[PDB]
């Protein structure tokens, strides 16, 4: 990815490279489960 190359050879061999990586990742997850349950009872929703 990120590279800058400079090369001389005849007078001197000088190779100068700058290697840079910039990475940006944004992840948004919105999951909403709805369960209908009787009063004072256990109920479950499972997805997976």
């Amino acid at each position: 990815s990120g590279i800058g190359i400079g090369f001389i050879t005849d007078n001197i061999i000088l190779d100068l490279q700058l290697s840079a990586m910039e990475k940006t990742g944004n992840g948004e997850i919105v999951s909403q489960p709805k369960v209908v349950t009787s009063d004072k009872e256990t109920a479950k929703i499972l997805k997976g």
Partner: protein, 49 residues
Amino acid sequence: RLDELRRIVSQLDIPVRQVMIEARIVEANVGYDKSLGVRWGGAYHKGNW
């Protein structure tokens, strides 16, 4: 006692109520994925990203 028990018998000998339960599952999944790899490579002057 016979008659009273008979009346209870008449009430009790009632068909239990069956119900047909139809539950429908609806799943919709929509997926859009785009990826871009951009490459600028030159070996002539050694510039390659």
